Design a protein around this ligand. Sequence first.
Ligand SMILES: CC(C)n1nc(C#Cc2cccnc2)c2c(N)ncnc21
Length: 822
Amino acid sequence: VKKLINSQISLLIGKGLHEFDSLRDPEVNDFRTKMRQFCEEAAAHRQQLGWVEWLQYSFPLQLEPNRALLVNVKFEGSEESFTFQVSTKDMPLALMACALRKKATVFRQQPEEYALQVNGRHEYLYGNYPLCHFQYICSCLHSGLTPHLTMVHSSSILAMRDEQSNLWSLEQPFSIELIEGRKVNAMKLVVQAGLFHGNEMLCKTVSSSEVNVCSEPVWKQRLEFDISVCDLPRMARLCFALYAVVDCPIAWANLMLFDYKDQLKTGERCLYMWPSVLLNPAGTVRGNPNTESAAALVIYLPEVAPVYFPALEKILELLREILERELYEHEKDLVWKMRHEVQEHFPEALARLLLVTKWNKHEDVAQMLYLLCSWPELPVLSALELLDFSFPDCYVGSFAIKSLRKLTDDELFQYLLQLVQVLKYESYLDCELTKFLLGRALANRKIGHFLFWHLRSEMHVPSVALRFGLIMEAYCRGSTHHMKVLMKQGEALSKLKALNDFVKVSSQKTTKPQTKEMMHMCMRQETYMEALSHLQSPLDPSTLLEEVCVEQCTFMDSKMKPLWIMYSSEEAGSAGNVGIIFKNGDDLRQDMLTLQMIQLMDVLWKQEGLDLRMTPYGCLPTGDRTGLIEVVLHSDTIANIQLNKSNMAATAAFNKDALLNWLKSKNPGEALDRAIEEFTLSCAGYCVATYVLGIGDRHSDNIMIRESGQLFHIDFGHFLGNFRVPFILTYDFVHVIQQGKTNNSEKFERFRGYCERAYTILRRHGLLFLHLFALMRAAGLPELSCSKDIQYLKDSLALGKTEEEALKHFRVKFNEALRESW
Ligand SMILES: CC(C)n1nc(C#Cc2cccnc2)c2c(N)ncnc21
């Protein structure tokens, strides 16, 4: 069996386990064994959790950031069900108490023994919460639907649990011998080398003597660095660049001066280089794996004697306020001088003190660490700052995770994307972040689900394949059962790719009707019906994709020919009718970031009691230019509606009336007002979110509207201005906001209020967005590459002003936008 599991892992993670062995690398070997231990311990802990704790692990509650309602309840075993009236304020237990009482009378005759499942879903209602605190009981009230629930007994939950069981001495200046290379080019070659600790240089960047573009070059020259070897910090990083000149970059390579055992490196090394876009401190510190093709640089770290970075005990032995909220030399000096006072009175300024310490003087790093070692824990917001690449020291990183353990699962979920990207900054495979992420993921299956996909979706990238591969293996060691559940997803995704390639070929030779019919036959093959049915959705594991409806599936006719896949479930009813889009050919990372940030805005808004009726649909990259998007049903494009077709309810005398007629048609009589209100609110949310994010090229093809009135956006691939994008008011939306009237400043100005509140709320969390984008720079998105991009956000949230100023600023733009509107 142990053989079976390995091969399943290999298939799942998209890398063969044998490839790990062949590298014959101790670090990899240790990472693997230690982490397998850690993960297997976790699994053990799980298989003895109480039933409530199990539910908590497997189906984490989905909560919102008096009045009565109808709900239908039934028991696991039988068909008969009852429809109760209850209050939105009632606890789940109160509801369970009705159900049981009701069963006792029909079935001729203890609430605490149960949980309530959402019909056809991996979702449960339990805990001390009023019903309307539950996202599903909420959803129900807005959409109008009668919540449908099943009483699940503790012994059934336990059956699920069961089935799923598995030194100071050296003062001479540092130096390296540059021996030779083996590259391809046109001119003379030079090597530039600099020592880094994060973004900062630890001294000037000494270069090579130029040699002709010949070879296979040979240098054999001592490069000697402007710093003492007892002054190299633990996380010292040596960076090379090779280029040509009479300016043409060619390749770069980085390495840690200390191995993962704190021992300083000697003697010789071969560096397999990464091709170039001169110096790249943030670039991975591991060599290019394509050792066949890569230009390669041999160098020699002189054996200065075994020398280790000294133990912590050894380390442990050895106008303020006004500026304190970039700083001049003396200012920095004042800070450093006052470090105990910083510690004692402004612990929240840790980062600023870290950026002023002299990482190229061991004494000062010792002093700093001593302070860091008694430093009170920080708020989550400050911890997120400390994970930035500007803080490469592992004791800093350690403290940072320490301050992050207090993250809730919901918060952790909210920042998971960024945390995974941060793994790219990591210098060694065995690290605090990795242990932290793995531990939270083994303790929460939703976390586990999305961690997996964030990693899996990056396997095609040589620079992260090893790291992420190893993380996924460890995870799998920790959850045998979930591994199988994930394979079932991978199998579905394998078949969709096949089906999608077919469709792309077919549609170049034939009509859409024909291709669709072919897709359907393909899908109807046993192997596909089986692969595509009965899975957890990669977009949301709590969504069950049961039987695929072939007749409903189709494809979209835009370039990559995205696949449109519908599903249904008898057990879930209406809520079982769900759809996924498969797209192969585009980079989806962008859209996912944009969507996650809008989701974040919606959360912050709802936390101050503003519900802008947002539509935070799923988007999940899964593979190389491959991923899924969640289908929003009952929606159509503005453009499509604006086609103003004959023979439809929405037929208008004037095109400006089209969108409003459509809304009328879907929302007759008294319903109309609420729709117009949903439109207004969501419009405000999207106008603010796009303005803040610098998302341009919005137009009627990529804006959609739901039959409730809710407006939302699809296909963002441009943001942070990457064409200063102006605030956008669209006449046709304005016309819908003003209830079809040429003049209606009551409605229009309410609408201005909404935008203004939304914009002001976001400013109060501007630092959160800043910190989050900062970490994203680790992802390599072409529209998130440098400071000018973060600067875009700075400018959009006018974070450098008082609230009064920024609002005045905003107002001018908003006004300017209206003027632009016809
Ligand atoms: C009807 C069609 C325009 N469309 N496109 C959709 C889309 C999309 C998308 C999202 C990210 C990247 N590329 C395409 C869509 C959706 N999500 N729900 C319902 N309808 C949708």
